Design a protein around this ligand. Structure first.
Ligand SMILES: O=C(Nc1cccnc1)N(CCC1CCCCC1)c1cccc(Cl)c1
Ligand SMILES: O=C(Nc1cccnc1)N(CCC1CCCCC1)c1cccc(Cl)c1
Lengths: 304, 304
């Protein structure tokens, strides 16, 4: 029993963190096989970031300008290429600690763990959600660029995020491991609008199921609702509209608890319209949307 | 910017997790050097747990009865000894992945990361606080016993907790790495009272400083208070009384932000007496007490 914002064990990802220095700029890199992945802005100075011409900036750089340090040992760079907003530095040595991995582009609403790094050294690990507006509410300071987001299915690490930028609003923006930004963001020191964000409805419902499993039941009621009725309330409170796909993915939790999905929606409708009335659900005084239905099942069953 | 409930990177601790089986009972072990540490209740069956005579139960066991599996390889047990509520199994091989480590008994109010494990396999990592009543609000299921709590200063892992028991109230109880329980708990299937818990005042104040640093300032006011006045309010709202030692440890944050400790106490007094009025602080709709002053400084500065 109990329910926590659980991160994946960071071990397999720690063994891939390296420091990348190009000129005066230092950030984090991801060493998988004989390739080091890092944000392309490693080739910039603070001055260049206003409107960098990355093609031109990269042209003035050679393999020997990219200093890659794995803990304390130097890696020999034999190739360099820019793919979208990432630099791929071919090294002469394959990382002996490379785990089984995939590069995946996660969907908005999906969660992942972040291993925050500075100078190729890990500082901490936390569990995040990719917001519906493609930003993340991380904890990142200067030098955190290159820190990655990931998920782990048994021995396979699926890399999904690489940290690039902090928007002037304090939220974070980054790319998949092919350098494609999540959202409309560009790697430039300019004010960039993150779209209107919404609450991930399916995740809140999953977290309401986790609360039922762990004892918190005060929010349960004698009501039911329809997808149409629930969606009118979801619209009013800036919640993602619930679809049959979300209901279908909530199947396992509905079956384990015996609480129909639309009955749980009715509880969420009352919590939305009336608040928590000074009460808490799983230690939180608000509706938590950073646990997917899969995260709840994994944590409640003990999937290692 | 941003502020998250950050766990330490779990890598150094993952390399020490083993599975321990004695008869029909399987739990987690901690392999450091040539010793495997696990909860002594590994020698019990469900039936024995009502009032186990561990001395007698251990007497019926030999080195060959303790099956220790590190991932997939078997460890040869050459010795066994009970120290308080832990079993120390001497193995013939030193763990090649043993990091620099210490065994420390943490104080109530201090925080640590937990690497939740099942069958010697890690499932996740979360950041916890040792409650003032010596319980932890973890996420642990059957088989999680043996999962450890720890802190990391550069390359040294300080082990502070080992999971043993879930109280009938859903909270968790365990020992330091010498087998001494935190709190009045005994490793027996009996209803055991966890004392009246309080909120860790110094940690809430540290988290109020973290909010100021990260932009959340709405709670700041034109008021100040005294330690005496603040403590009358702390008493009324079940908060640990604030002492000069707590004020002294808040020094760094007070100096970085320019907000005197007693001024921040005055903000906490108004939040206690008036609530949050439908507002949030660092994404939380309640007063967070699971970040110590040191955790806030570490996260805000980027200590790896
Ligand atoms: O956001 C950034 N950093 C940051 C700070 C806090 C948290 N998360 C990240 N940067 C700064 C990167 C530059 C620093 C000076 C040397 C050249 C690299 C940034 C600025 C604009 C666009 C991009 Cl893509 C990145
Ligand atoms: O709390 C326990 N487990 C648990 C479950 C969920 C979360 N955290 C832990 N146990 C169960 C251990 C017994 C299970 C059957 C075989 C013999 C070992 C326990 C029961 C009484 C006292 C003690 Cl010390 C431990």
């Amino acid at each position: 029993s109990g329910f926590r914002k659980m991160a994946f064990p960071s071990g397999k990802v720690e063994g891939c963190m390296v420091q990348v220095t190009c000129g005066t700029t230092t950030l984090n890199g991801l060493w998988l096989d004989d390739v080091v992945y890092c944000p392309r802005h490693v080739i910039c100075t603070s001055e260049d970031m206003l409107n960098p011409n990355y093609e031109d900036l990269l042209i003035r750089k050679s393999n020997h300008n990219f200093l890659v340090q794995a803990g304390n040992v130097q890696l020999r760079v034999i190739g360099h290429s820019m793919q979208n907003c990432v630099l791929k530095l071919k090294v002469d040595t394959a990382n002996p600690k490379t785990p089984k991995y995939k590069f995946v582009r996660i969907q908005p609403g999906q969660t992942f763990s972040v291993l925050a790094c500075y100078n190729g050294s890990p500082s901490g690990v936390y569990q995040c959600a990719m917001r519906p507006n493609f930003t993340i509410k991380g904890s990142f300071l200067n030098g955190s660029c290159g820190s990655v987001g990931f998920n782990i299915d048994y021995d396979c690490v699926s890399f999904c995020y690489m940290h690039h930028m902090e928007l002037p609003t304090g939220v974070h923006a980054g790319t998949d491991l092919e350098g494609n930004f999540y959202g409309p963001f560009v790697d430039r020191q300019t004010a960039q609008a993150a779209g209107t964000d919404t609450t991930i409805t399916v995740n809140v419902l999953a977290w309401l199921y986790a609360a039922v499993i762990n004892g918190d039941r005060w929010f349960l009621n004698r009501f039911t609702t329809t997808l149409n009725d629930f969606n009118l309330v979801a619209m009013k409170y800036n919640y993602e509209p619930l679809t049959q796909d979300h209901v279908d993915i909530l199947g396992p939790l509905s079956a384990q608890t015996g609480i129909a999905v639309l009955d749980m929606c009715a509880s969420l409708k009352e919590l939305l319209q009336n608040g928590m009335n000074g009460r808490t659900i799983l230690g939180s005084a608000l509706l938590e949307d950073e646990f997917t239905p899969f995260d709840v099942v994994r944590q409640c069953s003990g999937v290692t």
